[PDB]
Amino acid sequence: MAAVFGIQLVPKLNTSTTRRTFLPLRFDLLLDRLQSTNLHGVLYRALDFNPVDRSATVIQTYPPLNAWSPHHAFIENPLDYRDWTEFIHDRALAFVGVLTQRYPLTQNA
């Protein structure tokens, strides 16, 4: 311990004991998540600078959304965070419908 290169550690060790189990992906639950309107604090951790009606830095995408990359730069960045909210709300909304076309809840729950 302690003098780890130029990183001074503490005299005290500390651990955590309990960890959670990896719970499955309910179809219902995604349908619900895809339905998010106020997305900002749902399928991602989104940073905005609200006071002057402006964006911050980083939309930290979750699952879903985790399959963004292939051509991300091609897409270019939207005008603001607030604006990006909308857009992917929109598009997501379109997508949920696609899924449903092929899979009926009633049947698939």
Q: What distance in Å separates the CA atoms of residue 53 and residue 83, rounded to the nearest whole number?
A: 11
> Can you tell me which residue has the tokens 């979750």?
62
Which approach determined this entry? cryo-EM
Torsion angle defined by CA atoms of residues 74, 75, 77 and 79, in that order, rounded to the nearest 10 degrees: 140
Would you state the structure tokens that stand for residue 44, as one six-digit string? 């991602």
Q: Which uninterrupted H or E stretch holds 54?
A: strand 54-61
Can you tell me the distance from the alpha carbon of 28 to that of 42, in angstroms, rounded to the nearest whole number? Answer: 16
Count Cβ atoms below 10 Å from residue 62 Cβ, excluding itself: 12
